[PDB]
């Protein structure tokens, strides 16, 4: 039951063994040596991984889960917003990646 039927899908990243996907990117900001360079073990704590090119140095911020189980935009931090405007303001780029509560890599093992 791993990989839950799935045939759904946009661009997943997974690194360190964890599941992740590009939910939101402006400006082509995402990218992805530069994501998995910049990114970190304690990162994998926050279930959801911000990126944003502010102060030109591409900071990864993770936060804890916004919304509400009965939200239907999952990958919306309310919270996200203020944030980014802050750093990576209008006339910037920035990403978001969301990580899965799974993960699905067929590690053909003996």
Do not use: P
Not at 16 to 23: D, G, I, P, S, T
Not at 46 to 71: E, M, P, S
Not at 77 to 93: H, K, P, Q, R, W
């Amino acid at each position: 039951m791993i990989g839950m039927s799935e045939k759904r899908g946009e661009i997943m990243i997974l690194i360190q063994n964890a599941e992740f996907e590009l939910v939101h990117n402006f400006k082509d900001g995402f990218n992805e040596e530069a994501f998995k360079a910049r990114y970190s073990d304690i990162l994998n704590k926050y279930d959801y991984i911000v990126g944003d090119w502010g102060y030109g140095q591409l900071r990864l911020k993770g936060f804890f889960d916004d919304q509400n189980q009965k939200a239907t935009f999952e990958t919306k931090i309310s919270t996200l917003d203020e944030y980014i405007y802050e750093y990576c303001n209008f006339g910037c780029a920035y990403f978001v990646l969301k990580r899965i509560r799974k993960l699905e890599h067929h590690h053909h093992h003996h």
